[PDB]
Swiss-Prot record:
Mg(2+) binds at D45, D47. Belongs to the tRNA nucleotidyltransferase/poly(A) polymerase family. tRNA nucleotidyltransferase involved in the synthesis of the tRNA CCA terminus. Adds the terminal adenosine residue to tRNA. Can incorporate CMP into tRNA ending with C74C75 (tRNACC), with very weak efficiency. This is A-adding tRNA nucleotidyltransferase. ATP binds at residues 32-35, 106-107, 111, 151-160, 164, 193. One of its GO terms (biological process) is tRNA processing. The keyword Lipid biosynthesis does not apply. It comes from Aquifex aeolicus (strain VF5). Signal peptide: none annotated. Adopts a seahorse-like shape and consists of four domains: head, neck, body, and tail. One of its GO terms (molecular function) is metal ion binding. Keywords: ATP-binding, CBS domain, Magnesium, Metal-binding, Nucleotide-binding, Nucleotidyltransferase, Repeat, RNA-binding, Transferase, tRNA processing, tRNA-binding.
Amino acid sequence: RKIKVPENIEEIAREVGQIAKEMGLRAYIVGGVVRDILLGKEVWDVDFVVEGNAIELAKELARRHGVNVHPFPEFGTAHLKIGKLKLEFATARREPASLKEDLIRRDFTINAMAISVNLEDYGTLIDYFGGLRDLKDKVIRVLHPVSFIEDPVRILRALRFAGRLNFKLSRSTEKLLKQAVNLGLLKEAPRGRLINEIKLALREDRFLEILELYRKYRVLEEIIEGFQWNEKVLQKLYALRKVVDWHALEFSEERIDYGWLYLLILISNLDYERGKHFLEEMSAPSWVRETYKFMKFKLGSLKEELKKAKENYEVYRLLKPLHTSVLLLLMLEEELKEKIKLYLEKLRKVKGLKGKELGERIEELKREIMNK
C-alpha cells in the first residue's frame, strides 16, 4: 500500500530519499509519526531511520539548508530543524541492522510502521507486523510475547496509548500485561523510566481514561509506596474533570497544566512526606509542589474559613493570593464551588495617600463594590 506524504513534509521527504540514493543508503519515516499521519494529524516532528550512516545523511541535508545540526555519534543519531520541521535521523539498530530489525524492537504494532521515502517506492507503507490492521481494529498489541518482561515500562505505555486512542489491549497482550504486573516485573523496573512515563501520561488530554486503565491493571500500587485507590478519590477525579473542562473553556488565556491536579488528587491520601518526595521525584513544577503542601496543611482551615465567610469581600481576601490550582481544588467542594466561580467571574475583576495607607483605602472602596 502507498500513502501520500503530508504536504508540509513532502519537500524534505523527497530530498532525504535523493540524498540517501546519492550515498547508497535507504531512508524511511518511522514510528509514532507514521501512526499520527495515518490518524490524520498535522505532524511537524518527523523521525527518520536510515539503513546506513544517519549522521552523515543529516549533516548533508543540514548543509544544503544552511541549518545547525546536532550529532550524537554514540547513538548514531542527529537532530536538526528546517523551518517549522523538527527532524531526527537515526541509524537502523537491532537493539548492519535492517529496517525490519529496527521496527520489530519497538513497543506496539501501531508504532512499528514505516513510510519509504526512497526513489523507487516512494510513499510505500511498510507494515511487517499488522499495524494497519490493529489501527482498524483499535488494538494495542506488542510485537513479541516477551515485550513486557524485556521492558516493563511498556506496561504503562500500553495504557497511555490505549487511553489516548480509546483502543483495547489485544487478548494476548492483556494476558501478558497482567502477568508481568503479577510477577512483580513492574515493581522492579528502572524507577526513572517509570516516572518519565507517568509524566508523559499526565500531559494527555485523556489522562483520566489512562488513570482508569492504571486502576484496572493495578499498576500504581506497584510504583507509589503506600498508594491505594478508593471510591472517594475516583469520584473526585471525575468531579475534577468537570471543573477543568469548565475552566479551560471559560478562561482559555489562564490554562494551566491540569494533569498535575489529577495527580494531586490521586496522592491526596498519602502521608505528606511521601507525597512531597514523589512530587520531587516527578520534578513537579513549583506551583504543583506548593499546592500539594497547601492541600495538606492549610486547605482544611481555608475550606472552613471560606464556608464561614459571609460577605463577598472576605471571600475575595481569602482567595486573592491563591494559585489557580487551589481555586480549582476548592471547586470540588460543592458548598464552596459557587463562591470560587463568583471570585473568578466577578470579584477579581473589580477595578495625599501614600504607600500602604493608599492600598488600605483602595481595599475599602473595593469592599463596598464587591458586597453589592
